[PDB]
Amino acid sequence: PQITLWKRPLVTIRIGGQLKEALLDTGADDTVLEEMNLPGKWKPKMIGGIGGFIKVRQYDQIPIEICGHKAIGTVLVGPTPVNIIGRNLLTQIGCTLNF
Amino acid sequence: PQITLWKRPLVTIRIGGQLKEALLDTGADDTVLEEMNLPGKWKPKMIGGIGGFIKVRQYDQIPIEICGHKAIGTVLVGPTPVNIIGRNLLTQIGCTLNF
Numbered sequence: 679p680q681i682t683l684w685k686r687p688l689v690t691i692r693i694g695g696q697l698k699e700a701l702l703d704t705g706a707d708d709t710v711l712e713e714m715n716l717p718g719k720w721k722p723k724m725i726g727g728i729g730g731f732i733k734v735r736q737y738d739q740i741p742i743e744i745c746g747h748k749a750i751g752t753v754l755v756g757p758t759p760v761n762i763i764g765r766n767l768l769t770q771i772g773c774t775l776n777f
Numbered sequence: 778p779q780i781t782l783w784k785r786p787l788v789t790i791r792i793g794g795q796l797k798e799a800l801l802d803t804g805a806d807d808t809v810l811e812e813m814n815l816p817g818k819w820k821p822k823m824i825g826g827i828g829g830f831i832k833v834r835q836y837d838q839i840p841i842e843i844c845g846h847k848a849i850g851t852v853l854v855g856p857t858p859v860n861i862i863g864r865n866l867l868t869q870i871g872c873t874l875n876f
């Protein structure tokens with residue numbers, strides 16, 4: 679679809695048979711989800727945002743269906759204010775900015 | 778134009794006699810610029826993201842040129858690591874997400 683920006687670009691994603699709302703975030707390098715349980719080995723990681731650095735858990739090769747489009751990639755889990763879909767997966771679903 | 782997301786969506790913006798590189802950021806409600814001594818009235822504000830909150834100065838009705846598109850609106854000025862063009866100005870240059 680085409681998504682305008684007068685409202686937050688929130689979409690439904692499917693991860694582990696759970697539906698969640700996530701924000702399409704072109705300013706985010708990474709995909710970062712609020713506290714949740716995911717299967718597999720994780721590696722501790724640190725990432726930086728506007729307010730400083732946080733600790734997150736890195737899960738690789740995780741499938742997510744973003745608004746009907748399939749991705750399989752790195753998902754970070756941690757204390758993000760909102761679930762965000764970043765560039766690593768935006769590229770997988772063929773998302774571009776247009777004006 | 779169409780901007781892919783393989784790399785950070787950085788573009789040239791103009792605010793007075795300052796050209797700067799800024800992120801076209803669909804995850805940002807508002808525009809946040811690195812510290813600069815803009816003229817006129819402002820109000821203090823706190824904004825939050827990954828890592829917590831920072832203190833900014835909100836300036837209203839500031840003209841910005843973004844990739845040669847004209848915009849005018851609210852700009853938040855403070856100790857951000859990166860210049861951020863938020864949805865308030867993205868809608869004004871006609872910016873959409875497409876996939």
Ligand SMILES: COc1ccc(S(=O)(=O)N(CC2CCCCC2)C[C@@H](O)[C@H](Cc2ccccc2)NC(=O)c2cccc(O)c2)cc1
Pocket residue numbers: 701703704705706707708709710725726727728729758759760761762802804805806807808809824825826827858859861863
């Ligand atoms: C109200 O206006 C706002 C409020 C918040 C923000 S925000 O910047 O915090 N922010 C708002 C978001 C924050 C997360 C939850 C939803 C709200 C915009 C976001 O795109 C930032 C941009 C960014 C990039 C690099 C360094 C610092 C910031 N990305 C990131 O925080 C980010 C960058 C690179 C890697 C990464 O893992 C995350 C912007 C405008």
